[model samples]
Target chain A: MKRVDVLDSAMSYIDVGQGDPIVFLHGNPTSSYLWRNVIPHLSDVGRCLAPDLIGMGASGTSPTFSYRFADHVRYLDAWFEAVGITENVVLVVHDWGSALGFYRALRYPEQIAGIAYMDALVQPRTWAGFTDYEPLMRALRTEQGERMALAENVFVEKVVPGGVQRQLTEEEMAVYRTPYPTPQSRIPTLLWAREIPVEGEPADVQAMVQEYADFLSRSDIPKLLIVAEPGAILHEGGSELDFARSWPNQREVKVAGRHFLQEDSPDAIGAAVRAFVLDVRERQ
Target chain B: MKRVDVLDSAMSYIDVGQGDPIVFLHGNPTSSYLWRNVIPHLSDVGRCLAPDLIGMGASGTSPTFSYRFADHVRYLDAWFEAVGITENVVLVVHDWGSALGFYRALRYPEQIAGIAYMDALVQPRTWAGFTDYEPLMRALRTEQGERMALAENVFVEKVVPGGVQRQLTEEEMAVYRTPYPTPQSRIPTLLWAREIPVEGEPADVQAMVQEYADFLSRSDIPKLLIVAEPGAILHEGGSELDFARSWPNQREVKVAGRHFLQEDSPDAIGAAVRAFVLDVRERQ
Candidate 1:
């Protein structure tokens, strides 16, 4: 992992591997560390790139960085341009990474050669289901959530482990916890949660997702869906499946893991990505 | 396994297990035999009911049965009411079973206690994706498709094995093949494929899937999604995952299998259903 200056903040990302470029975008509450295990497997096949979203991870959050979706995308776009990722880049994303990558893909559809993603780019229609996290989201949006986020670092302590199928070891959990040592450091996590697009309250975010949905429905780009078993936001029997089936140029594979699929099944994710790249290459 | 007469057809079903009423609805090209491995695991936990949709699977096809989605539901509804399943039925559906059960669930949401299903209830939105099977479905709708389906039993001879991740033994393949020995006997398989909602051509069927999507998104009832690894309609990394996330009161699990998941992962599906049933019960 290395840190680079992008849009005023020092953004941290892992850039290794060789051959074709594959960019991995992480969601909230985690950083390039999330892709540590996943990237190693892909290095021999292609260049594996994973970047920390603006405020989270080891990246510096300037005073100007509010950790909003728009800000995240702006900085990410700069990073992409700065890195000279002009075309034929494959994207792999999860969680909020879905939104981040999609924003760029929609603007530069031609730049992306293929996409293999999971847990990100969730169905926009399921925005109402965010109510299931109402209590947590409501608190995060309020002073109480702010207090807990800042003081206790609840996202690192609770949310991360909760999202995984297996409990994270104390040592493993520390990697996440260490990043947010103080309440103030937890602002990004809190902000990401607040942006969850609940009941149309986060109007812009919802609209953004709607645009992504349209792209997913119509885009003929080669796409691969890497699904975890369950306990993630998206899975079988949902509209996303409908979307995958509906979308042109898409293939899906299931891994035995949860939302943080990398934690439990990095090998599978890695193998799937390698195979997908080759499959797309062969198709071409 | 027992046979019951409904709507002038003798329907075959397996009604075992003895705690709560958990209904298993099979899709096309198979019957109650589909549940042979899965039912035993659940029989100890709940009353497992697997029914062969009329006109297939030893279920006598009446002169009145046209094998349309409408006719299947009419007979299934009568069968349910006649069986005294007035309320609290947990549904497990696959393939065409998705359409059959969703029809019942939407009309009488109150009667459903919970649902645990897989490889079924796909979104009609993905109709364009139906072209993935263009050559086959196109043929099935044409006189040539009819000739292949009826005379050669292509669905049983080819489609079933192709959908499965593991190659089936000759003996197992025989069970599916024995059901549709002649072209006349293969009418149901042909109809199911023909009815697949493609590009809004089958407006009513598309409308039906839309209704199911609405019900899934809005309903607070406990829902479990049993996803197969690959080679199934609703596998990992597609819109189903998105839909599962968007819906309320749902859980998803994955098993290593294909379209005929029960054949390979019966134990996993059974255990998932048992646990989900208990989980829902405990929540209540």
Candidate 2:
């Protein structure tokens, strides 16, 4: 794993394997290590870019950092711009990664290429489900709040691979836990956990999810939604039905395992992605 | 366990105890049977009054039944009125039960001699925490879509006591499961699950939760909040914090167990409730 800096705070990332760019975004309590295996596989086939969102992974925690969807979008924009991927780049997104990916897709829809959506929400009225945790979040993002684990602590420890049903190898998990060394280091982790869009008070998150979903619905983008067998957060519903009912060029495939279906059934996912990307590119 | 039909549509219950009255409310996938053990001890003193909220746990469900918090307030009113116990009631509540119970207290402050909250939300905010279930929620509620289990399923089987975690035991849970045997039967479950103030879309639910919280703060009813350790919805920082922060006369106790703490740590909860009820009455 190699590191790349995308911000002045020196918040950096790791790039592994090489080929068509398949950027993987992780959700709460998770970091770039989530894409360790997929990175190698896809890198062997093409370039694989995996960056930890600010306040997570191997990133710097700026006290001034605003932990919201807009912050996430800004960070994502910086990563892509610094990576110098100006042309067609294939996107492989999961969990919060999907949100970052969707923002990118909507912001730079002209950047081209195919998209792989695994266990993520991209639809109108997104964040319509999680409004209960606002107080805890307010505590976390402020000067006074209880200390919590960030990357390696909670997100890497459980929320990510553990939140799902599949098992993770100790070696595979060590990478996820490597980033944070202390409670303060877990600042981003805690804030990320806090800013979840409960009641849409956080504003940009659900609206951003909605914007991407609407864009996908209107554009001629060939999208693939890869779902796991027994998922935790993103299960088989809503946008699945929405995509089923709305998108003409979209496809849905059920993988063998949980939310991190890529961890459990990457081969099938890779094959599906290759097929979809080829199909979409042929039309273009 | 004895079931008292408060109405043909609603079943009021007494877990058949000896001493004091501790009414326990059940959340989704549960019923009054949640008080199986503690009822014996608490009822041994005076009485234990509990009920299955409408469309749940031996309660009748109609396609047009009201399931909002304020509506639940009315149900509590009618049940109390039907039972004719207007004095010295030691009100114990859980889950959405807290919302209804607090609202009832706010309306009839003098009627409640004391209030004991178990993992219930009783603050200005409805709830706050993210477990990655936003996507599946959309599926279950959006005019006929896929149903995700973790979002509403009995996934935490090991954590519950008396097979309580799996929603209900074979015999007891069968009764709880009977009414929700099909998707249509599950309408109540789904609607109640959606009633949570997620991003405050159905703003009324959030508004009611806030209104009730406001009511609890100034009402001067002796209050006790028993936090079931590792609680399902309410824990240290979420709704639990709100309870502690709001009331100056409040007492806080932590028990070792899940959301159904009364079932898991019956002796501890029963003993605590017995003590708390005595304290509240003395203070009153």
Candidate 3:
């Protein structure tokens, strides 16, 4: 694990092994630690890199930052430049990681070799189209959600565990809890949940995901969608499934787990990424 | 556990609960016992019936029967008719169960209320297109395969355990071993492995799957593809993934387990099936 200054904050990341570079990016309430088990398997094949998203892991968080989706991308963009990953890179993303990484791919399509991701790319809805956890999401946008998220740390205590099918051990849960020991520290968790693109609100983030979706459809790069069973917001019989089905040069692999499928499917995801990378190499 | 006569054999089945019917089918080298943990959850919603395919489990085997794919389908079709499950039925199948149950769906498309299946339906090929376990499958098809399968009962001793990620306890292994005490009794296991359609051989079964694939493509009835990760044959890249993506009225749910994903993903599969059935009901 290493830390580097990225704009206003120091971003923490793991950069190990050697060969082609593979970047692993995680979502809200999770750090690069989410990829701990998955990275080891791929390290033998390439440089396995996982960075704690700004404000959410061991990275430095500023009282000045708002923790918006844009905020995340700016920090992540800075980190990428600082790390000097200009080309021949594979990006693995989940949740908010998808938003940040996809934005980067859109800007620098030539820099990435291939992409593999789960649970992130389905464009979130505006208030009119809001279908998932509307009440919860609405609450998270307000003072009560702030109490549940910042004061009570409900996202870490319940939502994270709720997403996974198998129960997390205390030791495992501790890793998530480590970053948000204080109520004030839980701001990012609350902000992320609220950042879910509602129609008129968060117009910028909503537009960002839409633009990402367009890129996903048009990009000829090798892409893989590893869908989690009973997935959280973006899976099942909806636009999410349609986007995956229509994407060019993309392969969708299903794993039998839930929102945080990583907890139960580290080995499956790792093996799929390895095969997918090799397949991309063969095809190209 | 109950027994019902099908052709020349008496097939053992578990019939529990009552409401809309949900039929559970097992594959070679296993029995309805595979559904023990899964059935309890669905019992409250509907009638849960799991049948041990003829020649395996407590079902009485026939000296006259050949245990071919056609023979298995003949008995299974008879079993369904005998059980008076002509319509409004949810069919859940795994492995060879997919072949047999899918054949029924082709014949009586209207009878099936919904279908959920895993680790099956991706066509198998010979040495030419053989993508999985080529040497092992070839050996299983030849006299050597027969010796290992029938004479040594390799499917029970190794294949079953190999398919599940979690090591089966001695007691769990005992259940699998119970059905194939002797070499002759292992004939079904041996035959099923060989029945895997190769390139040109087993033309009839190949034609059967091709026809089933047609039904899957055309069927508007709710179809759920519960994919198993690190799965044996069908769940990975290739025609299976292609077939799954193209199918209409289909939802694919992935589980984090290997072949025989039931052992590790019973809860996940069960929950998906339950939600799927209800979704179909609402759409109807």
Candidate 4:
């Protein structure tokens, strides 16, 4: 992992392998460290990249930064330009990273070759669709959400391990734990959970998510929707999975994992990413 | 159109074009003539073939023939071997033809390269799943169906025209008329209708249809599912269309047609087929 300077702060990313850039984006409360095990299987085939989103991992945010939906995208946009990604890229993403990656790919259709996503937010949802995670997600939008994040750090300490199927080792949990050692540093998590669109309430985020949703439905670009057997968000028999399956030029792989799929099924995730990359290369 | 011997009788097909063999199969009451306009667009890219199913069009059936589901498949297999075809093949089919194409591809994965289907029977139906067409279909399995098919010749005279979006030319209706002028010659249509599996009534036919449906869901073979605006059987907002959209390695195009899409969207069908064929060749 190396650190690079952006406009107001420095961002850290793990850069390895060779060939077409394969970028991994982790969801809330995670870092570039989330893709640690997945990068190995793909390193030989493509230049693997997993960036620490600003204010989340080894990245810093401006004092004035609001951490709104658009703010995160602006920083990521600069990172892609500064880092010089593959003209043709394959995105491997989970959770909100899946949303952000799709938002980025939609802007540069020519640059994006394919996408492999697990337990992703491919579209905005209704609270009704939230099901088992409803109460937890709903609370995250209230005073309860802020208190849980700034005062208690519940996301890193609980949700990450909760979403993963396996018993994440203490050392495994420590990387996420170290990122936000103070109440101020954990603000990104609280804000991210609140911004998640439900029934198109946060009109802007929903609009952004909806733009990518339409693209996924019609674009002939190759796509791999990896659903965990009992996925955290795009779970088995979920509405999101049904929606993704309905799209064109797509394939699906069901593995043994949940929302934070990389934690529970790193090898399976890696194998799928490698095969999809090779398949995309062959199509090109 | 030409006739060649297969088993106890002869089969007829319209064969044209220069390269990879693309076989077109027409469903009950229709003939090789169903593909007339669509063939010209594809003949240059492939060895375009439109075969008249046994007991329909110019094909002949033995006096002892049963016109059972397996009987149609057996004769089709013989016709395939008799005609020297592209070792790697593509199938373009409509209605029951789609069911047969998928089944044949399942059996000879090595020989099949891709499939393009319209308003197809991609899965067996539960009576509950057959909403709008339920009454028409349910009636077909009863004495009412036999009366309409064997005596009134309603399938050829009424259902075919009703299935096509545009008003079919009299010349078009005339070709279908020439084949089954007598009631006895119309038994195949009646038999074919009754055998259409619903809720596993005819255990063997439903089992056969189920096998191909499974193959479609899992196979990575390139597929084009051309659906009509108000499809005759696989109509809009129907369960069948939902099922097809869920399959992998697939692309879909919507056109202005119904059950007999050839009569209404021949050019669009031809265009989508050419584009998909070119697309499939690039993948190979």
What TM-score do all the candidates reach, one by one?
0.49, 0.45, 0.49, 0.50
What is the descending TM-score order? 4, 3, 1, 2
- For model 3 the interface RMSD, in Å, equals 31.9
- Using TM-score as the yardstick, the better of models 3 and 4 is 4
**Candidates 1 and 2: which is better by lDDT?**
1
* Cα lDDT for residue B46, candidate 1: 75
* TM-scores for chain A over all candidates: 0.93, 0.80, 0.95, 0.97
Off by over 4 Å in 1: A1-284, B125-128
Compose the digit string of candidate 3's lDDT tens values, residues B236-268. Answer: 665666666787878889888887888998999
Q: What tens digits encode model 3's per-residue C-alpha lDDT throughout A91-182?
A: 99998888888888988998989999888755656443335556777887764664678668888898889888888999989999999886
Minimal lDDT window, size 10, model 3 chain A:
A124-133
Best by the lDDT measure: 4
DockQ of all candidate complexes: 0.01, 0.01, 0.00, 0.00
Candidate 2: stretches off by over 4 Å: A1-284, B1-8, B15-21, B124-128, B131-146, B149-175, B239-245
Report the C-alpha lDDT of model 1 over B1-284, residue by residue, as the tens digit: 68777865668788886877889888879888888887776788778888878878767663322576777888888789778775778888888887788778888988888888787765674643442556787777665664577667888898888777778998898888877765545767877877776667467888988888787789898989888887357745667556656778888898988778888888998888888988776775
Candidates in order have lDDT scores of: 0.76, 0.61, 0.80, 0.82
- For model 3, the docking class works out as incorrect
Question: Per-residue alpha-carbon lDDT of model 2 for B1-284, expressed as tens digits?
Answer: 34444432455465455544567776655677666666665665666777877667666542123455555566667777877657777887877777777777766776778888786766533324523343444554453321332223332222233323334456754544555543323434555565666656457777877777776776777777787766655666665465555685678788886666765687887788888876765664
Predicted structure 2, TM vs. truth: 0.45
- Sorted on lDDT, best first, the list reads 4, 3, 1, 2
Q: What pairs collide in candidate 4?
A: none
